[model samples]
Target: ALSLTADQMVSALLDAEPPILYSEYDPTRPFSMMGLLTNLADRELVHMINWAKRVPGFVDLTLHDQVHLLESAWLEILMIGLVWRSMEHPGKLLFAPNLLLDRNQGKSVEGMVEIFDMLLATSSRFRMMNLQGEEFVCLKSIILLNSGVYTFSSTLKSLEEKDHIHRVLDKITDTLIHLMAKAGLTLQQQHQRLAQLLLILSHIRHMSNKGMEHLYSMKCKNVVPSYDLLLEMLDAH
Candidate 1:
């Protein structure tokens, strides 16, 4: 939005994303469910740092604030990406390229069954509406731009400039709209589609809430190894 043509801006936004993680492993290690997710999350976390840096307007924030935003939004980004990736299949979640789980299969992970259920239900909107990768990437940028989530906020001790972040969010959303307009839809269609896209964002928070719950549980039980990056983010949360 700041300096690139609409095509290049969309290209830049999509280009910065971490891309999919594919792996080959036994499909039925029920006990290993969370462990696999933990491994994948850690892998994605490393790439997110670069992705966040490449995101337009993200780097312009103070270093402290920039880090805080990534910490807050990483889980949501992961969940949203998962939802979009698996939207095609109604019952199965394609957690990774090689990993697919249904409700009963997901129950193999002790505490994750409910999280699976919510996402299965949430995926319907994306599936029915035909979510595009272009919109999905822009939606993710908005999520990161929020930095602090609505449902789980305890108020940051301080952020250097909240208003600046707000401005960046507006710019990104406009980029989304501009891309939509290029598709040659009527204004009403654009309004409705954007409304649907924004409304779908609330589901990301729902998924992130479950992620935070699992993160807290994993921390307490010492079930998963913690990263300094994730730990700092939790403290900031």
Candidate 2:
């Protein structure tokens, strides 16, 4: 009920769309439920990014700036929602190594899968298919930049820590180089390079237990997990 209220308010303000209300009796609330809601909600941002890239105004922005915008919005909402999910679920999904920050809001695969099913049913209402792919790029940039913002917020002298972060960031650059090699991005026109960097900084947290542990430890000095080499395996995709 609370999240439904919050979501409706957010959509109305962000979209110019009419207010929407998920039924109060429809369930999906408890702290645990809100966590699940956020997980589902996060995907919509991706859809949003895809749509934005197809829009006119967004195309005028520089590639780096474009990605920065997307990363910011995704991070802002995702972090707040994750915080709520953590408070609601407590130690359950909170303990996952890779998912510590993203915390598995949905209690079970079945639960999340059901939500996706509902989305399929509600597809026309969300107008998901109509959204352009560029919107996804824009939305993803928001999520990517958000991780950087949240990390900087964790400390006083964030610059120093950010430097330390770059220690591992090198690998992401290498991956981007290889990707660009295969894709036909012009030396400058291929915004993919900047987008690639944003993706690295943005989603690296999703890569390891140490990263998750770092998030928890930042919040409460608790341990999570950290595995640096995981990116190698991920690059093939």
Candidate 3:
């Protein structure tokens, strides 16, 4: 059980939840429709920043380390969010209420779906496994602290910041265990399920890297529109 003060922080985490998208998506022009939908991706940055700042110990980080961590894991966070939103609707990747799509609609933007193909893939996995909200929060934080923070310690900078980030992730792991234990499954099944969750992280890793690679190529081709934030985001070290 978390201390009373810590529990208050967890409530803030859920209360300030950011909407995955908050913009219009144009479908008539399928190619640049990506820009409209992708536009939401850039806009979510403010929400993420506010949300993280409210996190229990996140702001204690140096400003440089904070931005570095967010930059490293931004796409993955969005993709994971998409996967969570996708689970209820079945086959469609839900960007916002107005901008939902399946293979046909999403594929219309010439190789557009290929780069974000993981949206469908990860959503399918979540749906297949019947992922829960509690699980999603736990896993999301792990990726944020791990993929978002760990590999970047795979860094000549921030050795102690690495330790702080590790502790945050470790606590999330503990919380995950506590939640699962209370779910009343056989101990074996609990272990089994967590193993499955751990394994799914690889696909998250693959998904983000694939998007980064395609983003570079699309910029090279000069077809994709850019945002100041998008440029800053890709400059992630």
lDDT of 3 at 177: 63
Q: Rate the local accuracy (lDDT) of all candidates.
A: 0.75, 0.36, 0.69
TM-scores vs. true structure, each candidate: 0.83, 0.24, 0.81
Tell me the tens digit of each residue's lDDT in model 1 across 29-96. Answer: 64366767777877777677778778887766666566667767878888888888789888988888
Question: Cα lDDT for residue 144, model 2?
Answer: 40
Which residue pairs does candidate 3 place in steric collision? none
Which residue window of length 10 is worst by lDDT in model 1? Answer: 149-158
* Candidate 2 lDDT score relative to the true structure: 0.36
Measured on C-alpha atoms, candidate 1 has an lDDT of 0.75
The candidate with the higher TM-score, 2 or 3, is 3
> What is the C-alpha lDDT profile of model 2 across 18-78, one tens digit per residue?
1111212223644244443344443444444544454323334444434544543443434
Give the 10-residue window scoring lowest on summed lDDT in candidate 3.
Answer: 1-10
Give the CA lDDT, 0 to 100, for residue 202 in model 3. Answer: 87
TM-score for model 3? 0.81
Candidate 3 per-residue lDDT over residues 175-205, each given as its tens digit: 6666677778777888888889989988887
